Structure 1
């Protein structure tokens, strides 16, 4: 579980600082805002040897965020393969797992109370305030999310991805829908689910194709 919080009013980047400072496992570096109001950003370390599959990890983390956000707001969220949390077609939280030398640094951002969503992103991004019309205590949101991550990572470590695969698939945006791999005009088809290793499975004209990276969008 997370036993210590280092809360910053402002900082350049939580991911970056965890690359630079030696924080202990169980510590979440939180920031009210990152300098390259209402958002929630935090990072923490994981044992790189406990999670060697960084396709499955972001999905389990995304799942954890979606579960915590629904418990707090009562609103159901989707997961966009391979690492973001969405409400319908708009992103509410982003998950990033970075391998840096000796560390596995997890970074998560959640749009909680921001009031002004630019016009350029209004169609692809949202916030809990926008979705619910209410402000939420960011620390309570953080604690709930951290507790969910703790529980799922523990079960993930003790069992396997098979404990989350089905749940993740049921929340995947575009599941069953026709999609294309952004930038790769060749790969197009129905997104049917995930491979055992966490890869996205597309049923193309010439059978199933397992995708291990990239970004999907509806056709």
Structure 2
């Protein structure tokens, strides 16, 4: 589990910080706001050896965030392959993973209580407040997320990605629908699920294609 929080009122970037400072596993670095309000941001360190497949990891992290936000709010949430958490076609939480030298650094942002969603993004972004008409205690959100991440990641080390696949798929946006790759006019087809290694499976004219990266959309 986590054992230690470092809570900032503001900082440049929680990821940035975890690169420069030699924090320890079990520490979450949390910020109220990053400098490039009502949002929740935090980063932590994983063992880079424990998570060599880096499509599976962000997906289990996203699963965890979605489980947590639903426990708290009762609203169910979707997973975008390969990494964010959505309510409908709107992003509520970002999930990020960076190998930097010796470290695996995980970054997570959740839109909790922000009041004003800029005109340009409001079509593709949202907050818990927008969805529920209610403010939520940001630390209780954080705790619940950290607890689901601990739990899921532990099961993930003990067994495998198989304990998560179908849950992930069943939450995937555009699941079962027809999609294309962004700026890759070649691949179109139905989004049918995930491969063993976390890849997206598209049933194309000429059969199943496994995508190991890119961005999907409806048709």
TM class, shorter-chain normalised?
over 0.9
Q: Deviations over 1:14-52 (max 9, x none)?
A: 000000000000000000000001000000000001111
Q: Deviations over 1:1-23 (max 9, x none)?
A: 11000000000000000000000
Distance 2:22 2:78 in 1: 34
Structure 1: 5+ residue stretches without partners: none
Q: Deviations over 1:146-165 (max 9, x none)?
A: 00000000000000000000
> Counterpart of 1:127?
127
TM-score by length of 2: 1.00
Over 4 Å off, 4+ runs: none
- CA root-mean-square deviation: 0.4
Deviation at 1:84, TM superposition (A): 0.2
Q: Deviations over 1:141-195 (max 9, x none)?
A: 0000000000000000000000000000000000010000001000111000000
Deviation at 1:98, TM superposition (A): 0.5
Q: Deviations over 1:34-86 (max 9, x none)?
A: 00010000000000011111100000000000000000000000000000000
Paired residues for 1:57-68 under 5 Å: 57-68=57-68
> Counterpart of 1:197?
197
Q: Does residue 72 of structure 2 align to residue 72 of structure 1?
A: yes
Deviation at 1:128, TM superposition (A): 0.2
Deviation at 1:97, TM superposition (A): 0.7
What is the number of equivalent residue pairs in this alignment?
219
SS of 2:9's partner is: strand
Deviation at 1:139, TM superposition (A): 0.5
